[PDB]
Amino acid sequence: MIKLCIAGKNNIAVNSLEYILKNHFKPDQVAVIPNKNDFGVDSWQKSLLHYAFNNHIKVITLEEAYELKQIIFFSLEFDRIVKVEKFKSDKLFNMHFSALPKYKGVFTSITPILNNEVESGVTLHCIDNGIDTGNIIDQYIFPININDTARDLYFNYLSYGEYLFKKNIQRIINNTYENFKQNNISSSYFSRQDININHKINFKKTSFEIHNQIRAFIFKEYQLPSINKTKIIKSTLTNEFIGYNMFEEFEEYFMISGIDGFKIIAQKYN
Amino acid sequence: MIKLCIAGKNNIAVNSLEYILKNHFKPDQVAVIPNKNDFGVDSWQKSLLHYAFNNHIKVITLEEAYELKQIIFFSLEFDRIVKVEKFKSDKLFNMHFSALPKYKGVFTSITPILNNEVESGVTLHCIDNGIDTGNIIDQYIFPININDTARDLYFNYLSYGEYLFKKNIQRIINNTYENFKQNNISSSYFSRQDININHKINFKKTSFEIHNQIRAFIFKEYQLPSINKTKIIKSTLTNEFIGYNMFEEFEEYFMISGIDGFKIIAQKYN
Ligand SMILES: Cc1cn([C@H]2C[C@H](O)[C@@H](COP(=O)(O)OP(=O)(O)O[C@H]3O[C@H](C)[C@@H](O)[C@H](N)[C@H]3O)O2)c(=O)[nH]c1=O
Numbered sequence A, B: 001m002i003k004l005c006i007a008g009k010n011n012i013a014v015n016s017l018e019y020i021l022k023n024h025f026k027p028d029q030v031a032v033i034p035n036k037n038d039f040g041v042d043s044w045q046k047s048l049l050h051y052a053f054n055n056h057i058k059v060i061t062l063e064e065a066y067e068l069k070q071i072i073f074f075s076l077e078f079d080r081i082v083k084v085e086k087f088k089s090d091k092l093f094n095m096h097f098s099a100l101p102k103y104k105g106v107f108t109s110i111t112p113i114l115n116n117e118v119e120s121g122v123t124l125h126c127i128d129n130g131i132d133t134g135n136i137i138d139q140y141i142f143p144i145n146i147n148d149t150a151r152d153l154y155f156n157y158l159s160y161g162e163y164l165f166k167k168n169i170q171r172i173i174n175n176t177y178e179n180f181k182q183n184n185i186s187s188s189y190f191s192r193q194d195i196n197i198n199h200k201i202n203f204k205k206t207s208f209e210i211h212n213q214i215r216a217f218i219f220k221e222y223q224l225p226s227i228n229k230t231k232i233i234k235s236t237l238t239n240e241f242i243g244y245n246m247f248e249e250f251e252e253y254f255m256i257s258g259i260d261g262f263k264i265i266a267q268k269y270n
């Protein structure tokens, strides 16, 4: 019988499945639900379907998972909203890429940088019918490094999320895990509508904030931001005072300061 | 000679001047520079100009203060940015109503609430030529209570600002105070153009955030927020679950919940 389903994508799903097969269940006891964008090829992330091909793991549909009594359903960057009533199992779990209750919703590699955070986290929670609202089982809070891009933060999510899954999976299998109501205070949410990938930079901001408005959008597989129609691959915030509200194009980089006058080096793609 | 000049408005300027006269300097050793909104009339705050009238304190121009060597220049909600090179004195101080380096700029009774903070602060800093960028002498951080309005937050800034002035003024008069450069990290700025006082509420947000979008604009002397063209005097958030994305207009109030289902009561005006 299928004891566990991994639904989702990327290194967190693959490496979590790997850890299951090494320590808990056999290929017959596990199934995958891939994302609509999985096409069997490793690239900047490993493919779940490719892992499933290599290890003889069967694909199921959501509808199939609904009817599997006492399946552990683990959502690891799964692309589908799930109604808990459809599931015969109530052992439904999700790894969300934020320090819940903050930064519910999407683009959580962009939203904390853009909203001036210096920390984020990964949260293992119970799935309920709301978006990232379910009861928290565990959480790892970690720094946003000052020059991290959205891509760096995403990679840290994948890594800490894998660690949190590994740490918690035994008590989830054994059904000896605790869960707690999420606080209503400091609860925040961003829908897709709340992010403009092409947003005009506001230069009437601090160096930290101009730097954030650039680096929140540096994620080359998706996009790079532009200044004067030139793509930016990296932004560096220094503590060097160069004067208020500076802007100078060199051939390889822009030198920028905001209202507090700290030097930013924005490296051009050219 | 004039030893100290208080520039600005409201109970912090008046009460800090009263403290100077009781503890430090005679009326003939002090001067004021009132804000342009000061017509000499006590209202929901005391008039600095009215207080100077009753206490035989001289009004000076900025242009006069520039020429007074040794003057302790203290801005307490002063409405004008000064050019520090124009002063003969280097004893230029400001009380800013944020937890610097966060929320430089204006509307600091709105911006921390609107940006989901649970604390703010008052900061005593050296004036330099930037907006709220000068080195910190002292800071006091305090809670934003879950149902505080901008108005409540402003009255807390007034009282903690007055506290911090009275704590530090002796060390400032004896020139025995330390100052520290502000961090470049976590530095944030909001100008008048960054706030729309007729904020349209985004309901595709948590209960905390909808609540924040209402209570950040509750300051009756300036404006009240509206839902469906109806003025709101009070927003109350509890951790009570009432279902996701609720909106129920009653005769005297709205009952609202966001993506996480927490109870908001928005009380209608008179
Ligand atoms: C689509 C897209 C993504 N990104 C970055 C920023 C985003 O955090 C990250 C991952 O994108 P995603 O895989 O589409 O998912 P997202 O971060 O929006 O998270 C959400 O969607 C996924 C699929 C859910 O499983 C997850 N639980 C959701 O929070 O890649 C971009 O920079 N530009 C983009 O266009």
Ligand SMILES: Cc1cn([C@H]2C[C@H](O)[C@@H](COP(=O)(O)OP(=O)(O)O[C@H]3O[C@H](C)[C@@H](O)[C@H](N)[C@H]3O)O2)c(=O)[nH]c1=O
Pocket (backbone or CB within 6 Å): B008, B076, B077, B078, B079, B080, B095, B096, B097, B105, B106, B107, B108, B109, B110, B150, B154, B197, B217, B219, B222, B223
């Ligand atoms: C003008 C205005 C003000 N307010 C509230 C919100 C604001 O934080 C508070 C104080 O208004 P303010 O006196 O204009 O001061 P503000 O917070 O914008 O601070 C700035 O202006 C003052 C005058 C400077 O001395 C201060 N150092 C600046 O930070 O009153 C409103 O709600 N609506 C308004 O239209």
Ligand SMILES: Nc1nc(=O)c2c([nH]1)NC[C@@H](CNc1ccc(C(=O)N[C@@H](CCC(=O)O)C(=O)O)cc1)N2C=O
Pocket (backbone or CB within 6 Å): A075, A078, A079, A080, A081, A082, A083, A084, A094, A095, A096, A105, A106, A127, A128, A129, A130, A131, A132, A133, A134, A190, A191, A192, A193
């Ligand atoms: N019931 C449930 N709760 C969850 O927290 C959860 C699931 N299912 N399924 C797995 C995963 C999926 N996460 C998400 C989160 C948001 C969107 C999404 O499409 N957001 C839309 C808004 C949709 C709406 O308003 O209803 C957007 O425009 O951003 C998709 C998948 N997840 C936990 O992460």
Ligand SMILES: Nc1nc(=O)c2c([nH]1)NC[C@@H](CNc1ccc(C(=O)N[C@@H](CCC(=O)O)C(=O)O)cc1)N2C=O
Pocket (backbone or CB within 6 Å): B075, B078, B079, B080, B081, B082, B083, B084, B094, B095, B096, B105, B106, B127, B128, B129, B130, B131, B132, B133, B134, B190, B191, B192, B193
């Ligand atoms: N040089 C200096 N630095 C300060 O930090 C400081 C002073 N002066 N003087 C007293 C007080 C003045 N605070 C302020 C803050 C903002 C505006 C203001 O007019 N802001 C405009 C933007 C104008 C511009 O971009 O130059 C706005 O639209 O927000 C005025 C006074 N103050 C510390 O509080």
Ligand SMILES: [K+]
Pocket (backbone or CB within 6 Å): A095, A096, A097, A105, A132
């Ligand atoms: K998520």
Ligand SMILES: [K+]
Pocket (backbone or CB within 6 Å): B095, B096, B097, B105, B132
């Ligand atoms: K200020």
